[model samples]
Target chain A: GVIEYSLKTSNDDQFIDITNLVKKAVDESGVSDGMAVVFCPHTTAGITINENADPDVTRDILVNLDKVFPNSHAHIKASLMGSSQQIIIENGKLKLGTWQGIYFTEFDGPRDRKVFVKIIL
Target chain B: VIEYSLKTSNDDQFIDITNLVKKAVDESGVSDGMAVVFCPHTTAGITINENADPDVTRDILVNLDKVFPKVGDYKHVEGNSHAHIKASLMGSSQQIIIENGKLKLGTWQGIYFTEFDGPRDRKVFVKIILE
Candidate 1:
């Protein structure tokens, strides 16, 4: 069975917290005691976990990422590449410590992306 | 039957990147097809793609709220409700294309586990079957 959902980004540079979206999958799955794993199906986009505590933490990370892997960098200028990142969740929760947040990474402009999730018990 | 496992600790601050706890499904002994992955804990999350490039991984870890704002003033508190919301938004589960007994993820895609509310331990589970 496949559950389909859509995500539309508002700006060329933007973000959307999808925690509820994932929660829906869990609740809807009806698997009370198990694990769920979500995945993205596009390139130039990926997934991650970070500080969901303060908006600034994310901002600082991204701002610094730009400094390190700046889209304006010569490599990005020539590549304009597409990529994706994968993550996992287990024990009914992700093995994350404190101050971490999962991120759905989008490297291109504001676009629509799809993530697939499954569970095991 | 399902094979689920977990890892927990009290570090309250750490990141585990391989986290690809998902697999395609088939009969009890099926193989070589599509596998469905899943996650369930709220305030935490999941993904299964690429885990190769360290820089790309960092890009994602850094800019989390360009999409989900922490201080959007929602209706939850615990001060970390925002984190819970963010985790829920990302959902929990992923599907993978299997080939040659390996996950057909992109050159840069790998699996990752996300935790929005912690300082506590967490867990992620994976399901494998044939297609």
Candidate 2:
């Protein structure tokens, strides 16, 4: 199953929680056990799975990313975080850890974005 | 899984294996699907990054080294705790959409085999499954 979602970021460096999108796609796919392929095709954006319980973790990540990459390093930052993140599915749900949250991180954005979630058994 | 092996030449390197992945897609004969490129080693990883400029990977490695330096207060006995953290951060697998039997990646995007602590031989695997 292939599912797509449109997203927009409000900041230049931001980590938007997208775990719900993956769960929604899994529910819609009806696959009991498989893997969820989450991809952000843009070169300036990335998809990552990280801690979600504390918002500070996301804040620190974005801050550190900017600190590490600085400016024209958006492309490198995106690549470091990567364009794709995968999660295993079990019993019709994403088998993520309790604190795991999928994020659509934007390095050069305040614009429109898209995410692709493909489910396969 | 279509497995391939190549020797990593340095301590920190990003080897572009996009063509090899494209080959796997072509051989799989899947018109539309998802391709999972995976690295089995904990100290190495797989990711999608800009393959247009050689400096991009260099800059990435430099930044990674700064962030997860070789010297750190850690408990790993292999003396490569930084490598493990770097690999985990970069991730061990990347899944890309395959459209029209081609990797639906951005123009500059390419799959990379990231070697953090290596001068050893490594393997990459591609598993393409239909949507």
Candidate 3:
């Protein structure tokens, strides 16, 4: 079976909850066994996993990440990599265990972003 | 059998340190079965996956930069709001199935904890239990 999903980033940055998204894919794919692939295609955006309970978690990450990997920095390799994040969700569910989440990376302006998830049974 | 591990967040932020969480689970405490729980401290989180090669980590990070450009116009008092968002995007925790004392995962998959923003102390927690 094969399953897919996508999201559009309306703001410059936003942390979207992909739990239901992943779960929906798993259920819809009907892959009793195997893994799910969550991939993103963009230049100023990608994907990731993190805490889902507290909202502050993402808030802190976006804030601090900017501090560590600031764009204004002198030696930033902007041309090499485009926007994207790929995750493999195994088992029947999204395969992220519990308390885990998928992230949509937003690098450039407030533009739309696309994410594709594939499941292999 | 079950196992739990903890990571002390030495730096303010970090990401995806989960590869080792599951690997160590399988190698240690010969349970030969089940799952692993990767935990963390601070307002952050934890998980498990790939760590066999270096390029995987490098490329993973490079692509993230391309997407979440890492620069924004915000006025948060702490200035780490972006880090919070990145952390949210990255996720705070993760779990993987362990079969035969090992996480039944991809050959190239390694666990990682992605810290989009850092310069502060951080920690991670892990717990492996049989099904």
lDDT of each: 0.50, 0.80, 0.52
Docking class of 3: incorrect
Candidate 1 lDDT (Cα, whole model)?
0.50
lDDT of 2 by residue, A41-111 (tens): 89988887765665655665566556556745888888878888877676898765455678898888788
Please, what is the TM-score per model?
0.44, 0.57, 0.48
Model 3 spans with C-alpha error above 4 angstroms: A71-91, B1-131
lDDT of 2 at B7: 94
**Candidate closest to the true structure, highest TM-score:** 2
Greater DockQ among 1 and 3 belongs to 3
The per-residue C-alpha lDDT of model 1 at residue B1 equals 25
lDDT of 3 by residue, B1-131 (tens): 12344343433323445555655685566455444343332234442445575666567557755555545544444554444444444454455677666666777665666655554444454545444
Residue B94 of candidate 1: its Cα lDDT?
53
Q: Specify the highest-DockQ model's number.
A: 3
Error of 3 at B72 (Å): 17
Q: Give Cα distance to truth, residue A57, candidate 3, Å.
A: 1.4
Instruction: Rank candidates by lDDT, best first.
Output: 2, 3, 1
